[PDB]
Amino acid sequence: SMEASCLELALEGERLCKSGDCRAGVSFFEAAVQVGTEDLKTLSAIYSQLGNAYFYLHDYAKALEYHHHDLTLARTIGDQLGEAKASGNLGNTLKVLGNFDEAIVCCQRHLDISRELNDKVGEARALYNLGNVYHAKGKSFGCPPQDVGEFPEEVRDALQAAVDFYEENLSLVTALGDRAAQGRAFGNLGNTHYLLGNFRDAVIAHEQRLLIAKEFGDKAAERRAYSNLGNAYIFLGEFETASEYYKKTLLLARQ
């Protein structure tokens, strides 16, 4: 039937994206769309795959559109988890585009549904996703030195809010034992502090990020941590310190 062949093409697409070549994976997903199916669970899944595929490819407009169809459809068939997820992805995409307000609503939904269903895994991710949004939002005021000295309570509020999500996230992910996740949260938590002017707090966060990076054998994350650490010391005045972390950074990407 047309079901079977649509099922095949998607399955392929998954292994293709799973194995690095998402460009071709997209094509197989689109193809499976072109074939189509009376099973909307499956279709829903496929649009999602496309949404992310295209997200990774930096074509955010198309990701938005594919997740919006996913979201709609999950609502259509009463798939709460599916709606939680599609929300998340749409939210993140909206963040990337700079439509923070609607992004917040979308990520907020993801959270609420994940709480309802008592999905702690999903709950924590949404907490991280929200973190990034409020971060991005507060970050996108004017430019990122004169900032830390003077800026509006409604921007503070936006950043402090991220901090609160990150911390909550962290807490959650300590329970689930997810080192990777602590990795991500720590980094962004630190930059958020950096902007807020909490530089000693910044360091702590990135030291944890670095440690976790080293533990995973992750050079890019090592690459960053040193970088972000350089910046904070600079703001405390420790230039000889900064000088070295910066050296390590340049020294790293070499290796």
């Binding site: 099922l7 998607a10 399955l11 998954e14 099973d39 669970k41 499956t42 829903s44 899944a45 496929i46 999602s48 795959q49 949404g51 992310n52 997200f55 996913d70 599916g82 939680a84 997820k85 998340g88 992805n89 993140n92 963040k95 990337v96 993801h110 999903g122 991710r125 991280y128 996703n129 990034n132 990122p144 990795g183 991500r184 949260a185 980094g187 962004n188 930059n191 950096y194 994350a221 690459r223 960053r224 970088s227 972000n228 910046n231």
Partner: peptide, 18 residues
Amino acid sequence: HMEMEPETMETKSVTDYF
């Protein structure tokens, strides 16, 4: 200026049927 961590996207599979 600052270096940030990647996003997480939740992910659905066809294999969820199985």
